Amino acid sequence: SSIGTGYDLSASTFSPDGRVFQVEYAMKAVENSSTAIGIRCKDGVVFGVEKLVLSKLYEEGSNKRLFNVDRHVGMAVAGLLADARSLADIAREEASNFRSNFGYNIPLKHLADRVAMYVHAYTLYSAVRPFGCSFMLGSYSANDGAQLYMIDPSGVSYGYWGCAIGKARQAAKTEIEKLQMKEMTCRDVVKEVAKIIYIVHDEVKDKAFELELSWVGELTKGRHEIVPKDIREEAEKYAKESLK
Amino acid sequence: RFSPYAFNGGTVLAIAGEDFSIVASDTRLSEGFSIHTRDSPKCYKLTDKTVIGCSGFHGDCLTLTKIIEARLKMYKHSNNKAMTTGAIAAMLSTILYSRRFFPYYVYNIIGGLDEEGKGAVYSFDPVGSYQRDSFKAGGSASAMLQPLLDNQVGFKNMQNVEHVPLTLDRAMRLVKDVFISAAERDVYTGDALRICIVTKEGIREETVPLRKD
Amino acid sequence: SIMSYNGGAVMAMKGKNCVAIAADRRFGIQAQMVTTDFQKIFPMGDRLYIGLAGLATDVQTVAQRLKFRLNLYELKEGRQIKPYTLMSMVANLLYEKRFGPYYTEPVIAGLDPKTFKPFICSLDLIGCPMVTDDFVVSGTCSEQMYGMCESLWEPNMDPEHLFETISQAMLNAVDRDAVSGMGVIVHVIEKDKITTRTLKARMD
Amino acid sequence: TTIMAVQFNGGVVLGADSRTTTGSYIANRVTDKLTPIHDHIFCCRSGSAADTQAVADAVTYQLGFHSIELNEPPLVHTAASLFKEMCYRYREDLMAGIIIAGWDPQEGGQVYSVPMGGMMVRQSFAIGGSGSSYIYGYVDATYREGMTKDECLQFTANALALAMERDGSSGGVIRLAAIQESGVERQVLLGDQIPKFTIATL
Amino acid sequence: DRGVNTFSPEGRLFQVEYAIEAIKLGSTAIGIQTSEGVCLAVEKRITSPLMEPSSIEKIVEIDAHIGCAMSGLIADAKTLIDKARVETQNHWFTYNETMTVESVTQAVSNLALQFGEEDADPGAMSRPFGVALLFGGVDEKGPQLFHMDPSGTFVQCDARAIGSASEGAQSSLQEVYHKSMTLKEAIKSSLIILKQVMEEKLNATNIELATVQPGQNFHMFTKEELEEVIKDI
Amino acid sequence: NQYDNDVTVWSPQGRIHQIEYAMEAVKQGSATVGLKSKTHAVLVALKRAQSELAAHQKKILHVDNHIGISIAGLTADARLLCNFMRQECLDSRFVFDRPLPVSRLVSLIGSKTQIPTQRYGRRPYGVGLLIAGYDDMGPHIFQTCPSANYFDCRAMSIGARSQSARTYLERHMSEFMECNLDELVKHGLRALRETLPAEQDLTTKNVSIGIVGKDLEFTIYDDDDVSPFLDGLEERPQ
Amino acid sequence: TQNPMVTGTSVLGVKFDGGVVIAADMLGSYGSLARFRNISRIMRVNDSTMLGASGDYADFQYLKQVLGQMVIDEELLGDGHSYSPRAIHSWLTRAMYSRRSKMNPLWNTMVIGGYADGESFLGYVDMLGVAYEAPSLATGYGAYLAQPLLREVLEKQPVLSQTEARELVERCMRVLYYRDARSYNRFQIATVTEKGVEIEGPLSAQTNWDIAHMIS
Amino acid sequence: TTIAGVVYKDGIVLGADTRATEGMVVADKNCSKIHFISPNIYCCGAGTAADTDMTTQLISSNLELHSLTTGRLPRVVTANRMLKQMLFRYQGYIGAALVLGGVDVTGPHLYSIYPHGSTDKLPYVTMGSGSLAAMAVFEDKFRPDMEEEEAKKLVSEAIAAGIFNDLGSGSNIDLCVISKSKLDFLRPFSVPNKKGTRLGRYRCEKGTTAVLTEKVTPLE
Ligand SMILES: *[C@@](C)(CO)[C@](*)(O)[C@H](Cc1ccccc1)NC(=O)[C@H](Cc1ccc(OC)cc1)NC(=O)[C@H](C)NC(=O)CN1CCOCC1
Ligand SMILES: *[C@@](C)(CO)[C@](*)(O)[C@H](Cc1ccccc1)NC(=O)[C@H](Cc1ccc(OC)cc1)NC(=O)[C@H](C)NC(=O)CN1CCOCC1
């Protein structure tokens, strides 16, 4: 990854070794942003995001990196928050179009494919730039079970049991490989998600942070909800206690 | 095929004085031979100085009022001032003419104060034709209210009566009396009479019951 | 009737190695006659003629628009147009106006370039080709022209026999039609010459 | 036409007559009004022959692509929703009375009615077409809760035979189709096979 | 080589910045707002005695109560002045009243950054307007003077100068201008400052003067009108 | 140096310079402050004189009966964006007859401001806004950037030397909620004061105040209207 | 819609002390034929507002889908703002008039009921965009039969209890079944309250037919 | 018109009369109503003649384009779909009633296509104004899997019934036989109607027409 006499100026231009650098630089944007994780349990999916506060003058709840795409679908973002919100709007609209045409809640794998096709469309031309955003999508159904997907700036879509996107993605994934998520209840996962975030967070280099948590599963009747303050505060107590 | 219009009845009245303006209307909303509601006052405030009254097809009256309010803010944002009564009357003419080939089935009467604090009344047709006058009736009962006003306020057809300036009290009694008289003959008019009074300090409302049959 | 507004009558006939085309000369608006020297037969290239009957405007408009395409054809191609090719060009032109047609029913008569072989056809207002080996008619006196041609036409007629037949056919059919007449022009097409004649006819 | 679909436990039973009319002339005395849309999903067509056909062909195309993309055996409700969208958007242009009936691994046997307006409703049994008028009384008197597959076949055949008997714009041959998990099975009734209810007068 | 909508590292648009530089090449113009009215002065800057001075119009009326003086690329102002004229007449047609000086200024200011390359109409502007405008008029809020630049920023001024010599003219106004001077003093002051900065000698032909006041409409000063004020050496 | 010409060009660092340069316009603009209580939301803005003989440039603009904005950066981009905000508000009242929730308007800006940052030959909106509003959820102070990112604020200040105004609001943020309207404005312009060089202070000429809250609709106080708030000038220490 | 097909008849509504009650029979008539005997013509919009629709059922199914999504879209944001009954009423007036003005009307007549912030809401909407509020509402033949009875009671007693309003509706639905030839003795009762929106299953009105024997 | 089609043992027989009418007068005594679609599929046409010609030529053109791309012999279903989807799109304003017949890699197929875009697949179909007369013959004499000569006789008799009974039909009987290895386009299969010989002489002799003007233009 070097040559840039052209090649790296447009997404419609290949490098001599066959790479689209504009997509790779768009991926660098998500690499610079703070870490976001999501874990697929036995009965749902839990999301966790380290939200870095730039100023104490911002209200608790500002720059929310957790989104409701549909009444049953959640979205956690990393990277350029402007692109993240517009991608959420696209996901919202795709999910509502499905209901308006077919009469039921959009299956996650289909929603993930549709959105990823949109993401990919921004990697082919000089007229547009790729999204500087990676996002995860979570949903739980009685007929489909727990499902978790992740889409990167290129438009690639995969199903995950556990996934990390952001600054310390490789550092976070080593902590998630320690968990037996397939047998775990989503009540226990919240505790573990909070722990991983606190470990991965840089105490000295980055300032203070707010922990954002959401879930969708059996416990929440299939609806994607923000984790209640009493349960969130319990997990933060537990995550700080893990720092012995 | 399908009729995009309905006649809902209702009559609006306005009288311009020296320092006041009265905008009055019955509160009955009709269709065919039945009453929709007995509580539907047609007079509506726009600014501190201007009141509008709409009669005819209620669908259009509701829409048109919602258009005017939007436009009032649009003017306010751009020109940094409230729209004057004359400017509202002039604008309404263009809004009504914009639908020349698909007319608003609507009779408007604007009442309020002009730029010198005097009473002003503006009468409209469905397609936007308008003028300033001292008193006007518009609606299902306009043919009944008008001749009496032309006689009493306009002093027409009487031989020797010195033209005494209108007082607020006499104009209020005249308004109440013509509507009571209208409720006797026009089937669309009745229930209650709503009266708006525009003066130096805000707008006042008064309500007198009418025949309910 | 829309076709009866201007009147008109156009005819074509096959000979031995020749082909004749005749038309009436009246231009009228309903009952009133206006012009006595109105043109309805148009040259499309030496040994190829089109006759147009119907609404006088479209009679002119089609001829003018057909000649437009003919000239572009004859310039792009290095050749004169064949009688079958012109027939298809007319059919294409008229069918482009399928739901808003030109009120004219054309009649084409000519000899085939190189092989000098006779050709006759008639068309719809929406351009349906109809080829025959004897005669084709179009006009307000459609029925009258048929009665004459079915009883006068002979299999192998020479240029002069052909002339006499189309002349009698056009002349006597027109005489039973109120909106057709005021003279008849005849074009006879041989390999080496073209004979144009105007006949002595009733002017009522 | 007369068309009919009855839902049983493991799937659905569909039935139609075979008459196509152009005025008072039978243009086609043996018509297959039971149109396959997918493996287990069928539709019954009544109204305009050209209109219903075109919609059917568009739903087949639309559901075909949808199924492959979703990677699931298509829902009967989904196929019915594709009919609804078209029948509602172009309700002023089409004359279509459709009954969509089929099987899917999620909800089993389903019968949906899409009348001329473009509304959609699930029913235990549905009837449509001009001939369905004469059999409302019979169908309401005969229908029983929880009929077996073989009984539903008899029930549709009886109702249709009575309708073809009275209705001029219905007749010919009874076409039956049974759809369950195992697949689709078709049968045809000719002359003697049509349930005879004898001419009942003096 | 970049697009016309490219930001400099300082946070400005190159094309907009360079459009401001074009004014520095235009002929200088002065407007003064007083209690008794608004006066507008501008130098014509004739290059040949064969050229008719009456055809060079840098001060034009928009309505009876609004005048406009311009500096820079005169050709560009054609559209801006026309759009201002259409706006005033559209307002009368709809609202039966005259537009306020601020309203007109704002309407024209909306057109300033209406330029671009991609995602454009079949006739969209390719670049900013290379002109500065001085709107002098009178409405209900008395007499006001507004100044618009290529960036779109419009502001009320008590006294403002625009042009090649707007450096020395602005500082000269900050000496003479009192917020309660008369219109006669205002006209006198402006012409004095104008002749201080002009290359050519000031007379009744090489300059243009107009006044709008609460009493009477936009008035263009003729030769004789000018002689009356020029005579003060 | 070759990635800073278009918005569609990503740099090798994962940055877009055109969006970052557009943000510089907010810094180049005059400083403004916005703070809220439990009932009121107050905008205080410092006006600039181009050449102190012209009037101080406008800073606070109307959006609706419950929403008003303070601008920093390009004026022409500010008016363009304000017209959008005005339009969405008018649309809500036309259709639903209810005031558009502040949060929902701000997120509509977040979508509109994004569109240009991703198309070729386009540019970001070179303006940062401070939105003050009141709805069912109480008072609001919101911040928008040239990057379509927006922030929900306890208190915020943007512009030239806004860092000193930000540190004052940092110190006194624990007092804003239970405090009253008269004290809120005092805190607002005391922050705006900190931006000014030690020579010059606040006057009736250079201060603009916008207030929206529970009892009153959005009102702008400019010249003689601003003096009741200045009366109570605590004077500046350093 | 130029020509309605499957249609629903009367929809009733009256507000009481505590909330609003709405009634509609479960029939979809195809001309004079009673084709669909088991269809719901009442929908729950959100926690605070409900809707009953007269006229073309296919058009109602469209509005049900559109409003359905609107409520879903709001609950996604979770900003603490939700559509008031008055807001849905306002929106519906805008929708119906828009289609009327396009000369392609949604063939419907709606009754909106709601309870928000102590006071109860009841609104009417035409296929033309005629909208108003009223303490009692009735569409179709209900306007000629039920509304007269509803107004007579409210003359004597302006405020009603839930029970009094409910048994009044019972009486109104009984008259409608006697006199309207496009009705059906199987209806739903919908109720807005502080607790939320409840729709109750199949209900029949008890009928008297004694007047058969007294002709002679 | 009268047009008819039959499916027999080896393939398809298609039949048509040769009468075209304008009003209630015969315009063409010998017009071609059986149209070429592909070397293996032919189509009969009835109704608006010009619509018949242009619709049948457009689809023939589109199939050649298709068969050149595939390198394969075109299918009767493709001809059916192409004709069906067009005629429907034009809401029945293109007045083409069609009898489509051909032999595929799938086998022998026969279709009837209506102006509105409704299709039927049947062993025997009739279209045109003489369809009732032709359909009567089929209902009375048709048998499954009949021989080529027998099917030729059947279709011709059906067309004959349309000719001698429908005023819109007349003149010659045309046939088109399509099998797995052979195609017979029998133009005048039968000439059941002939003009009576003119035994009276009316030949107008030379010089019996008066001329006013004459111009002779020589050519190459
Ligand atoms: C029964 C027989 C009659 O109601 C059925 O509904 C049947 C439906 C069917 C037919 C074939 C295949 C599947 C299902 N309907 C018909 O046979 C139908 C009757 C009809 C004609 C016109 C209509 O208005 C649009 C509606 C119904 N017949 C046809 O479609 C025939 C093939 N075509 C014509 O009649 C031609 N019409 C089209 C409309 O304009 C007049 C000429
Ligand atoms: C039999 C003869 C009809 O009785 C056939 O359907 C035949 C089909 C045919 C004939 C020749 C070549 C190919 C196919 N139809 C006709 O001969 C047809 C009859 C007809 C006339 C008018 C109609 O009304 C719409 C429909 C059918 N004849 C013609 O097309 C004649 C030559 N042209 C016209 O009548 C001109 N019309 C065309 C339609 O618009 C109005 C003017």
Short mmCIF file of N, CA and C and ligand atoms in Angstrom, two decimals, chain C residues 98 105 124-126 128-130, chain H residues 1-2 17 19-23 27-28 31-33 35 45-53 128-129 166-169, ligand 2:
data_model
loop_
_atom_site.label_atom_id
_atom_site.label_comp_id
_atom_site.label_asym_id
_atom_site.label_seq_id
_atom_site.Cartn_x
_atom_site.Cartn_y
_atom_site.Cartn_z
N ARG C 98 -50.78 5.59 -36.76
CA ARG C 98 -51.82 4.59 -36.51
C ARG C 98 -53.05 5.13 -35.76
N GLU C 105 -55.86 7.48 -48.97
CA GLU C 105 -55.67 6.09 -49.38
C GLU C 105 -54.90 6.05 -50.70
N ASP C 124 -54.18 1.43 -47.12
CA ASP C 124 -55.11 1.96 -46.12
C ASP C 124 -54.75 3.38 -45.75
N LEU C 125 -55.58 4.01 -44.92
CA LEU C 125 -55.21 5.27 -44.29
C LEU C 125 -54.16 5.00 -43.21
N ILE C 126 -54.12 3.76 -42.71
CA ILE C 126 -53.09 3.33 -41.76
C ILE C 126 -52.04 2.42 -42.40
N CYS C 128 -51.99 -0.35 -45.03
CA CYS C 128 -52.01 -1.78 -45.31
C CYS C 128 -51.82 -2.03 -46.81
N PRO C 129 -50.71 -2.69 -47.18
CA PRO C 129 -50.40 -2.96 -48.60
C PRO C 129 -51.35 -3.99 -49.23
N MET C 130 -51.79 -3.71 -50.45
CA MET C 130 -52.64 -4.63 -51.22
C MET C 130 -52.24 -4.61 -52.70
N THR H 1 -62.52 -11.84 -42.14
CA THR H 1 -61.68 -13.08 -42.17
C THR H 1 -62.40 -14.31 -41.64
N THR H 2 -61.73 -15.58 -41.96
CA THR H 2 -61.70 -16.92 -41.31
C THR H 2 -60.27 -17.46 -41.22
N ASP H 17 -58.61 -17.80 -45.15
CA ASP H 17 -59.21 -17.34 -46.40
C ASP H 17 -58.32 -16.25 -47.00
N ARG H 19 -59.81 -13.03 -48.30
CA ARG H 19 -60.65 -11.85 -48.50
C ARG H 19 -60.29 -10.70 -47.55
N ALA H 20 -60.06 -9.52 -48.12
CA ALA H 20 -59.95 -8.30 -47.34
C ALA H 20 -61.11 -7.39 -47.71
N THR H 21 -61.68 -6.71 -46.71
CA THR H 21 -62.83 -5.85 -46.95
C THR H 21 -62.61 -4.44 -46.43
N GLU H 22 -63.04 -3.45 -47.22
CA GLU H 22 -63.18 -2.07 -46.75
C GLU H 22 -64.67 -1.68 -46.80
N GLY H 23 -65.26 -1.49 -45.62
CA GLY H 23 -66.71 -1.38 -45.52
C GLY H 23 -67.33 -2.73 -45.83
N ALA H 27 -61.92 -5.57 -50.89
CA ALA H 27 -60.76 -4.77 -51.28
C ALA H 27 -59.69 -5.60 -51.97
N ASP H 28 -59.48 -6.81 -51.48
CA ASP H 28 -58.47 -7.72 -52.02
C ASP H 28 -59.05 -9.12 -52.07
N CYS H 31 -55.28 -11.99 -50.54
CA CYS H 31 -54.33 -11.42 -49.58
C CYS H 31 -53.76 -12.50 -48.67
N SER H 32 -52.51 -12.33 -48.27
CA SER H 32 -51.83 -13.34 -47.47
C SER H 32 -52.10 -13.11 -45.98
N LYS H 33 -52.79 -14.07 -45.36
CA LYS H 33 -53.19 -13.97 -43.95
C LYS H 33 -52.37 -14.87 -43.04
N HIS H 35 -48.83 -15.61 -41.84
CA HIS H 35 -47.60 -14.82 -41.83
C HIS H 35 -46.42 -15.56 -41.29
N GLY H 45 -53.66 -14.22 -39.01
CA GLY H 45 -54.14 -12.93 -38.50
C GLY H 45 -55.52 -12.53 -38.99
N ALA H 46 -56.29 -11.92 -38.08
CA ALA H 46 -57.65 -11.47 -38.37
C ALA H 46 -57.96 -10.15 -37.67
N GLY H 47 -58.93 -9.42 -38.20
CA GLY H 47 -59.31 -8.12 -37.65
C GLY H 47 -58.78 -6.97 -38.50
N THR H 48 -58.19 -5.98 -37.85
CA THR H 48 -57.59 -4.83 -38.54
C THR H 48 -56.36 -5.28 -39.32
N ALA H 49 -56.48 -5.29 -40.64
CA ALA H 49 -55.44 -5.83 -41.53
C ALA H 49 -54.05 -5.23 -41.29
N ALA H 50 -53.96 -3.90 -41.23
CA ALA H 50 -52.67 -3.23 -41.01
C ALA H 50 -52.05 -3.58 -39.66
N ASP H 51 -52.90 -3.71 -38.64
CA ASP H 51 -52.46 -4.16 -37.32
C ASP H 51 -51.94 -5.59 -37.40
N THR H 52 -52.66 -6.42 -38.14
CA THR H 52 -52.27 -7.80 -38.39
C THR H 52 -50.86 -7.88 -39.00
N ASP H 53 -50.61 -7.10 -40.05
CA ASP H 53 -49.33 -7.11 -40.75
C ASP H 53 -48.16 -6.62 -39.89
N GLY H 128 -61.39 -14.79 -36.13
CA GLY H 128 -62.00 -14.07 -37.24
C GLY H 128 -63.50 -13.99 -37.13
N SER H 129 -64.13 -13.37 -38.13
CA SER H 129 -65.58 -13.23 -38.17
C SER H 129 -66.27 -14.52 -38.63
N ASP H 166 -69.79 -16.80 -43.75
CA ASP H 166 -69.46 -15.46 -43.24
C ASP H 166 -69.22 -14.49 -44.39
N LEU H 167 -69.98 -13.39 -44.41
CA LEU H 167 -69.88 -12.38 -45.47
C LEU H 167 -68.53 -11.66 -45.49
N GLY H 168 -67.83 -11.68 -44.35
CA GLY H 168 -66.50 -11.10 -44.25
C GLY H 168 -65.41 -12.01 -44.78
N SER H 169 -65.78 -13.23 -45.18
CA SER H 169 -64.81 -14.21 -45.66
C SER H 169 -65.15 -14.70 -47.06
C1 LIG I 2 -61.88 -10.50 -42.38
C2 LIG I 2 -61.88 -10.18 -43.91
C3 LIG I 2 -62.81 -9.42 -41.74
O1 LIG I 2 -64.18 -9.63 -42.13
C4 LIG I 2 -60.40 -10.43 -41.80
O2 LIG I 2 -60.45 -10.15 -40.38
C5 LIG I 2 -59.44 -9.37 -42.43
C6 LIG I 2 -57.97 -9.55 -41.93
C7 LIG I 2 -56.86 -9.36 -42.97
C8 LIG I 2 -57.18 -8.89 -44.29
C9 LIG I 2 -56.16 -8.56 -45.18
C10 LIG I 2 -54.82 -8.72 -44.81
C11 LIG I 2 -54.50 -9.24 -43.52
C12 LIG I 2 -55.54 -9.60 -42.63
N1 LIG I 2 -59.87 -8.02 -42.06
C13 LIG I 2 -60.05 -7.03 -42.97
O3 LIG I 2 -60.06 -7.23 -44.18
C14 LIG I 2 -60.25 -5.63 -42.43
C15 LIG I 2 -61.70 -5.51 -41.87
C16 LIG I 2 -61.90 -4.42 -40.79
C17 LIG I 2 -62.34 -3.13 -41.13
C18 LIG I 2 -62.51 -2.17 -40.14
C19 LIG I 2 -62.27 -2.49 -38.77
O4 LIG I 2 -62.58 -1.59 -37.80
C20 LIG I 2 -61.56 -1.22 -36.85
C21 LIG I 2 -61.77 -3.74 -38.43
C22 LIG I 2 -61.59 -4.72 -39.44
N2 LIG I 2 -60.07 -4.65 -43.49
C23 LIG I 2 -59.23 -3.59 -43.40
O5 LIG I 2 -58.39 -3.46 -42.52
C24 LIG I 2 -59.37 -2.53 -44.47
C25 LIG I 2 -58.53 -2.90 -45.72
N3 LIG I 2 -59.02 -1.20 -43.96
C26 LIG I 2 -59.90 -0.41 -43.28
O6 LIG I 2 -61.09 -0.68 -43.14
C27 LIG I 2 -59.38 0.86 -42.64
N4 LIG I 2 -59.73 0.99 -41.20
C28 LIG I 2 -58.71 0.38 -40.30
C29 LIG I 2 -59.07 0.58 -38.80
O7 LIG I 2 -59.33 1.97 -38.53
C30 LIG I 2 -60.42 2.50 -39.31
C31 LIG I 2 -60.09 2.38 -40.83
#
